[PDB]
Structures are given as structure tokens and as C-alpha cells.
Design a protein around this ligand. Structure first.
Ligand SMILES: *[C@@H]1O[C@H](CO)[C@@H](O[C@@H]2O[C@H](CO)[C@@H](O)[C@H](O)[C@H]2NC(C)=O)[C@H](O)[C@H]1NC(C)=O
Ligand SMILES: *[C@@H]1O[C@H](CO)[C@@H](O[C@@H]2O[C@H](CO)[C@@H](O)[C@H](O)[C@H]2NC(C)=O)[C@H](O)[C@H]1NC(C)=O
Ligand SMILES: Cc1ccc(Cl)c(Nc2ccccc2C(=O)O)c1Cl
Ligand SMILES: *[C@@H]1O[C@H](CO)[C@@H](O)[C@H](O)[C@H]1NC(C)=O
Ligand SMILES: [Fe+3]
Ligand SMILES: [Zn+2]
Lengths: 335, 6
């Protein structure tokens, strides 16, 4: 009854979760759905217990009564005394990234260009840049701004999915899961690296982790950081070292959500599971690492050091922050 | 403001 049912989004996450379930001696077991929204429905129905979510998905889940349990914490700079599990999270930087060779593309000349998004409804990929664009254009027709896009989750016949590529067989175009070649932070950055799009909306860490040999994956292995620039809201372009002064927003960290009635038990099982399979886990890398997936960010971001306790038993609006919840609410007025 | 999407 202490068994926790994780929800895997698509078949790559399902494989990873089945490995975790075998290694955990079924203390964790797996349900799978094709999209994050479908996993949120399985948790609402009580057919799964928990999954990790981007902050835009935490807004969907929290409007439905699910609660944040633990947050991803990556490597920090201040508070190094404090154990990872007890350290306040820092947010991550939402950025707009372009190629250096695409000279004279700036924030102010994005109209009619090609865009790459992590997925509809996600923080850096969609809520932050589209919220900003709707506000600045004074128009809700955000499906007409870029000439073509990959925005997984949108209608596959629309311009918002025109650049999406589907799976190895070219099926599942635009699905919001890792089967879509251009899904998520890594897929939207690959869409820009391959010059399918002109801009990608990702986070600062994705640029660094997929350049300069930080990834050995085939499409990333030869990318150089200096070949990219960030688009700043004042119309300037900066090197990717300057994200602290050239971002679109600071996003709340991805976090595990559950029904309120199972939160305490999900929390206790995850704190034990990361002791085993987390960053310096007893059985990681020997048997299984919960926070690696060959850069694919399956079930958790690969840069995750631990899942950390939340201060103040926060509601989902307190965890997201009032600035971000208000930004989302305004954007969702459009559709 | 107020409704779960499902
Ligand atoms: C942008 O993201 C990168 C990748 O996470 C950050 O660089 C890492 O920062 C830590 C210290 O915080 C270093 O120990 C790592 O070695 C760095 N990683 C890599 C791959 O270089 C970078 O700090 C972030 N920039 C900002 C402004 O937050
Ligand atoms: C888009 O514009 C709206 C309207 O200005 C912004 O909503 C406001 O945000 C501030 C800061 O959180 C609050 O003081 C206001 O009360 C909000 N106004 C309204 C009418 O709701 C929103 O933040 C902007 N979106 C983005 C991404 O910046
Ligand atoms: C200059 C600038 C302009 C617009 C935003 Cl959204 C941001 N982002 C933030 C920066 C620091 C702290 C919080 C935020 C935020 O988005 O809540 C900054 Cl940093
Ligand atoms: C499974 O959970 C039980 C109860 O908390 C614990 O005794 C056991 O150590 C756990 N094992 C693993 C491998 O996750
Ligand atoms: Fe995110
Ligand atoms: Zn509170």
C-alpha cells in the first residue's frame, strides 16, 4: 500500500520507469499515458499517484486540485552548506536562442520567423514567450505570429506543428512527448541547431548542456556555444554566457505533483528512492540512476541533483508565484 | 479563473 504508481509520458519514459520499478522491487510501479495532460487525468482518477511537471503543467494540475510535493534542485552557487534536499530552489532562466550567423534577428524582428517550442503549455517553451508576444502585439492571434513552428501539442495540421518531425518513422508528428524529435528542451534546441527554426524557446541550461562536447549525441556532438546567441527583451543579442542579463523570465523549477491525499506518502517514498538512485545514490551508477537518461530528460531533468523539500507547504499558486500565475491566466484568456 | 480543464 506504500507502493507509488508513477505516470510515464510516452514510451521512452515508460521504459525508464519500468527499469526504476524493477530496481525498486516494485516500491514504485508505472502507469503510462501519451501526453502530460493524460497523466494528470490518471492521477486525478487515482490510477496513478505522481509525476514531475514543468511549471505550466503544474498550473493545469493545480487548478484540478493536485499539489506540489518536492521540487527538482540543480547545482547551485549560494547555500552550499545546506544539503540539496533542504536547499531553497532557485528557478531557471527562460531564454530565446538563435544562431549567431542569423545576424540581425532580434526580439523585435521575430514576426514571420520559424520557432521551436518545448511544447504548448510549458513555461519557457510557451507561456513566457507567447505571453510576452500577445502582450506586446496586443493580439491574441499567437498562432499567426511565427510563419511556421514546432509547438508539440498544437493541432498537427496547423502552422504551429509544421516544423515538427514525429518519430523515427515519421509518425506521431507534434505529439507532446519524447517520441517527437523536436519535443522538450532538447528537441526544441535540436530544432534550432538543425536550422529547422530560427529561434528556440528553452532554458539557459539546455544551451550549455548540448554544446562543446557536453552532449555526445549525434546531432549535438559537434555544436559550439559561440555559434549561438540569446535574444534580450531590449532588442540586443548576447553570448550565451550572459543569460543572467538576457532572459525572458525566471521559471519555477519542475516539481512532483500528486493528489493531496497521497502527497505525504509520495514524498516519503521519493526521499527514499533518491537515496538509492539519486545523484550520489547508493545504487547509482551501479544499478540505476533516476536523474539520467542520455540527455533526454526522461521522468526528471538530467541536470537534477535531488528532489528538495518545499518550504511553507505551498499551494500550487504559492509554488508557481503570483507573477507567473497572473501571466498564465492572462495568456489563457486568448484561447 | 475557476475550473479544472477536465
Ligand atoms: C546556464 O546554465 C549552465 C548549465 O547549467 C550553468 O553552468 C553550470 O554552472 C555550474 C555552477 O552553477 C557549474 O559548476 C557547471 O559546471 C556549469 N555547467 C556547464 C555545462 O558549463 C550556467 O551557470 C548557467 N548560467 C546562469 C546565468 O545561470
Ligand atoms: C501580460 O500583460 C498583463 C497585463 O498587464 C500582465 O498581468 C499583470 O501582471 C502584473 C504583475 O504580475 C500584475 O500587477 C497585474 O495586476 C496583472 N494585470 C492583469 C490585468 O492581470 C502579465 O504579467 C503580462 N504577461 C507577461 C508574460 O508578462
Ligand atoms: C530583466 C528581467 C525582465 C523580465 C523578466 Cl520576466 C525577468 N525575469 C526575472 C528576473 C529576476 C527575478 C524574477 C524574474 C521573474 O520572471 O519572476 C528579468 Cl529577470
Ligand atoms: C521498499 O520499501 C520498504 C518499506 O518502506 C523498504 O523496507 C524497502 O527498503 C524498499 N526497497 C527499495 C529497494 O526501494
Ligand atoms: Fe520548464
Ligand atoms: Zn501557504
Amino acid at each position: 500500500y506504500t507502493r507509488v504508481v508513477w505516470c510515464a509520458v510516452g514510451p521512452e519514459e515508460q521504459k525508464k520507469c519500468q527499469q526504476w520499478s524493477q530496481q525498486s522491487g516494485q516500491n514504485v510501479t508505472c502507469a503510462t499515458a501519451s501526453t502530460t495532460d493524460d497523466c494528470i487525468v490518471l492521477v486525478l482518477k487515482g490510477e496513478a499517484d505522481a509525476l514531475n511537471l514543468d511549471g505550466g503543467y503544474i498550473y493545469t494540475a493545480g487548478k484540478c486540485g493536485l499539489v506540489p510535493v518536492l521540487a527538482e534542485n540543480r547545482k547551485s552557487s549560494k547555500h552550499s552548506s545546506l544539503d540539496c534536499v533542504l536547499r531553497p530552489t532557485e528557478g531557471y532562466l527562460a531564454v530565446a536562442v538563435v544562431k549567431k550567423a542569423n545576424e540581425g534577428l532580434t526580439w523585435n524582428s521575430l514576426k514571420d520567423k520559424k520557432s521551436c517550442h518545448t511544447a504548448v503549455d510549458r513555461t519557457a517553451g510557451w507561456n513566457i514567450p507567447m505571453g510576452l508576444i500577445v502582450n506586446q502585439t496586443g493580439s491574441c492571434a499567437f498562432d499567426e505570429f511565427f510563419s511556421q513552428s514546432c509547438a508539440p501539442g498544437a493541432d498537427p495540421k496547423s502552422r504551429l506543428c509544421a516544423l515538427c518531425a514525429g518519430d523515427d518513422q515519421g509518425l506521431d508528428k507534434c505529439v507532446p512527448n519524447s517520441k517527437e524529435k523536436y519535443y522538450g528542451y532538447t528537441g526544441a534546441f535540436r530544432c534550432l541547431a538543425e536550422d529547422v527554426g530560427d529561434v528556440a524557446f528553452v532554458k539557459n541550461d539546455t544551451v550549455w548542456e548540448n554544446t562543446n562536447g557536453e552532449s555526445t549525441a549525434d546531432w549535438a556532438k559537434n555544436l559550439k556555444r559561440e555559434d549561438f546567441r540569446l535574444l534580450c527583451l531590449d532588442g540586443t543579442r548576447k553570448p550565451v554566457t550572459e543569460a543572467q542579463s538576457c532572459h525572458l523570465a525566471v521559471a519555477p523549477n519542475h516539481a512532483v505533483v500528486s493528489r493531496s491525499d497521497r502527497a505525504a506518502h509520495v514524498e516519503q517514498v521519493l526521499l527514499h528512492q533518491q537515496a538509492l538512485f539519486g545523484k550520489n545514490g547508493k545504487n547509482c551508477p551501479d544499478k540505476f540512476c533516476l536523474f539520467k537518461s542520455e540527455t533526454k530528460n526522461l521522468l526528471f531533468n538530467d541536470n537534477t541533483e535531488c528532489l528538495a523539500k518545499l518550504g511553507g507547504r505551498p499551494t500550487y499558486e504559492e509554488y508557481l508565484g503570483t507573477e507567473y500565475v497572473t501571466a498564465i491566466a492572462n495568456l489563457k484568456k486568448c484561447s | 479563473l475557476e475550473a479544472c480543464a477536465f
